[PDB]
């Protein structure tokens, strides 16, 4: 884009980290110039620290103002716990069930399918377990995955692929456990 | 059960472009639209559960701009080093002929947060039904972005996500076919 003038970027990040609901809460504030963090506040410390030399003046200035520090130290309640309480129901408690389909595929052009693909899509949260079974016995060999894919729209997907040589009469099962369901989802494939 | 909520802002010169957003475990809750001065929820239903007063975010963008100016000078005008993006194209769901689906152009690991993205069907630009996210923050302080194209799968059409960015030598073309 023909404009190649130098860019200068500032970022600020206020991170509220929650362990076991709001029982343990830790606030981290970061100031980043270009790609480099310059100064940080961590609520485990309760004062600013310079991350690089360029941050030292800011750390010194802010830490001189105890009225200001007091407010940042209180933010674990007034900001982190407060926002968790507001957002919980539609973030922390969000549950969207996976759609599970199985289709055969091929490692390269072949007369017969030698891949079973278990597609698990449209789910939330991202925590999921996907297992392959052949005639009721778990298959651990010959399995590769995309891993967890974020869609950008508060859904995730994954594909979990099983390389195999099917024999007729065999039944393969893709089994999925996700917090949105109280027992496993299963899709069966007969070769 | 760990979770993280992040309030993330940036301001970039000389583009004079800014962003303010909240992130929950890597997804966007909302952003503030700078031109309309308005809270934009990522999912509409979130606005049924919570509010956000955009005025405070605008006040923060003004401080961020001033601070960028101080830092720029304090660094002896050190500019950002461009990091080009990694691009992947995929779909929403398993692809079936003539069933509505969505192509996703996933643009990751880049900075600064300026990128030019075009959807092409058979080499030609498509605008029908496209949409895109704002810039999402990464832990390495680079950016992530999504572009979307609703489509009808067929054997007659191929697609490309075309991405240009300062870190690249030439436009980056990611191809998708039935």
């Amino acid at each position: 884009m023909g404009d190649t003038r130098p860019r200068f970027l500032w970022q600020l990040k206020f991170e509220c980290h929650f362990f076991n609901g709001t029982e343990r809460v830790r606030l981290l504030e970061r100031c980043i110039y270009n790609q480099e963090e310059s100064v940080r506040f961590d609520s485990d410390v309760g004062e600013y620290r310079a991350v690089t030399e360029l941050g030292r003046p800011d750390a010194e200035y802010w830490n001189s103002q105890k009225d200001l520090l007091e407010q940042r130290r209180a933010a674990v309640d007034t900001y982190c716990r407060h926002n968790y309480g507001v957002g919980e129901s539609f973030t922390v408690q969000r549950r969207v069930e996976p759609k599970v389909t199985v289709y055969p595929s091929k490692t390269q052009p072949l007369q017969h399918h030698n891949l079973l693909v278990c597609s698990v899509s449209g789910f939330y949260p991202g925590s999921i377990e996907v297992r392959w079974f052949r005639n009721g016995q778990e298959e651990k060999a010959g399995v590769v995955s995309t891993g967890l894919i974020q869609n950008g729209d508060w859904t995730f997907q994954t594909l979990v692929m099983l390389e195999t040589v099917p024999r007729s009469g065999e039944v393969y099962t893709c089994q999925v456990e996700h917090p949105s369901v109280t027992s496993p989802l299963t899709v069966e494939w007969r070769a | 059960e760990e979770h993280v909520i992040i309030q993330a802002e940036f301001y970039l010169n000389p583009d004079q472009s800014g962003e303010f957003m909240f992130d929950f475990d890597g997804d966007e809750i909302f952003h503030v639209d700078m031109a309309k001065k308005e809270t934009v929820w990522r999912l509409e239903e979130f606005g049924r559960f919570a509010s956000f007063e955009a005025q405070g975010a605008l006040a923060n963008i003004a401080v961020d701009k001033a601070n960028l100016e101080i830092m720029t000078k304090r660094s002896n005008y050190t500019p950002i080093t461009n990091v080009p993006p990694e691009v992947t194209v995929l779909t929403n769901s398993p692809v079936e002929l003539r069933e509505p689906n969505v192509l996703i152009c996933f643009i990751d690991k880049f900075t600064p947060p300026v990128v030019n993205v075009t959807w092409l069907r058979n080499g030609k630009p498509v605008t029908t039904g496209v949409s895109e996210t704002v810039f999402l923050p990464r832990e390495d302080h680079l950016f992530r972005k999504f572009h979307y194209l609703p489509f009808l799968p067929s054997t007659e059409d191929v697609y490309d996500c075309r991405v240009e960015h300062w870190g690249l030598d030439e436009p980056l073309l990611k191809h998708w076919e039935f």
Binding site: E29, D58, T78 | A50, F52
Partner: peptide, 19 residues
């Protein structure tokens, strides 16, 4: 605005400013 508000944390001015 009937719904409970998300609260932002305010940005601080760096050393060396005024506005």
């Amino acid at each position: 605005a009937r719904r409970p508000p998300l609260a932002e944390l305010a940005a601080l001015n760096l050393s060396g400013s005024r506005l």
